[PDB]
Design a binder for this molecule. Structure first.
Ligand SMILES: O=C(O)c1sc2cc(-n3c(S)nnc3-c3ccc(F)cc3)ccc2c1Cl
Ligand SMILES: O=C(O)c1sc2cc(-n3c(S)nnc3-c3ccc(F)cc3)ccc2c1Cl
Ligand SMILES: O=C(O)c1sc2cc(-n3c(S)nnc3-c3ccc(F)cc3)ccc2c1Cl
Ligand SMILES: O=C(O)c1sc2cc(-n3c(S)nnc3-c3ccc(F)cc3)ccc2c1Cl
Ligand SMILES: O=C(O)c1sc2cc(-n3c(S)nnc3-c3ccc(F)cc3)ccc2c1Cl
Length: 123
């Protein structure tokens, strides 16, 4: 429907990264998904997600959610509710938001476009 940016939890990315809020169940859009280099361990997917205001490229799917990408079209443009996530910090100090449970509210094909004009979140 109209006001597509109203579909997304504007400000949730800043809340996750600055406040470390994990109680929220924000609605985000997938902008892109790609594998990372994992050698002889399970494939792992990194996501560029949008909350309508910001994009952030430091999301990863928990391994348990891999089938959503492999089989069920979790893909660019879909709109998802994040039901459970955590944030982990790597040795270099960068943070990764690991999506543990998520629900696709609208398929990529039902949305079809990057909603709004989100800009990259800076650290
Ligand atoms: O394929 C490649 O050669 C590389 S080198 C490479 C280096 C990083 N990287 C960054 S940034 N900061 N620290 C590291 C790093 C990663 C793994 C490691 F043990 C040591 C250091 C991250 C990914 C990556 C990849 Cl992928
Ligand atoms: O400074 C750089 O350019 C490089 S090149 C470079 C290459 C590696 N590296 C080698 S060798 N073999 N596997 C890896 C590796 C890359 C990414 C990763 F997740 C784990 C391991 C690890 C760190 C690194 C860094 Cl740091
Ligand atoms: O977004 C990120 O986390 C990273 S980590 C990261 C690490 C590298 N990197 C380093 S250091 N040394 N070699 C590489 C490298 C990794 C993969 C590749 F095919 C070619 C080169 C290059 C880009 C990049 C990016 Cl981009
Ligand atoms: O293959 C690749 O493109 C990459 S990029 C890449 C980046 C990292 N890395 C380091 S160090 N510190 N934070 C991260 C990082 C990992 C996933 C992510 F969402 C954001 C950041 C570790 C491995 C890796 C690999 Cl492997
Ligand atoms: O700095 C560190 O402690 C770590 S942890 C770490 C983990 C990975 N890695 C591989 S393989 N498969 N999935 C991941 C992974 C990366 C980031 C993350 F959130 C969770 C998992 C790749 C590089 C790296 C580095 Cl570099």
């Amino acid at each position: 429907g109209s006001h597509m940016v109203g579909q997304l939890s504007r400000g949730a990315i800043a809340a996750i990264m600055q406040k470390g809020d994990t109680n929220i169940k924000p609605i985000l859009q997938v902008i892109n998904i790609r594998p990372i280099t994992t050698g002889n361990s399970p494939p792992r997917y990194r996501l560029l997600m949008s909350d309508g205001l910001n994009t952030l490229s430091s999301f990863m799917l928990a391994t348990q959610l891999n089938p959503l990408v492999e089989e069920e079209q979790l893909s660019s443009n879909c709109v998802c509710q994040i039901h459970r996530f955590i944030v982990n910090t790597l040795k270099d100090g960068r943070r990764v938001v690991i999506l543990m449970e998520l629900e696709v509210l609208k398929s990529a094909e039902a949305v079809g476009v990057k909603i709004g004009n989100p800009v990259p979140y800076n650290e």
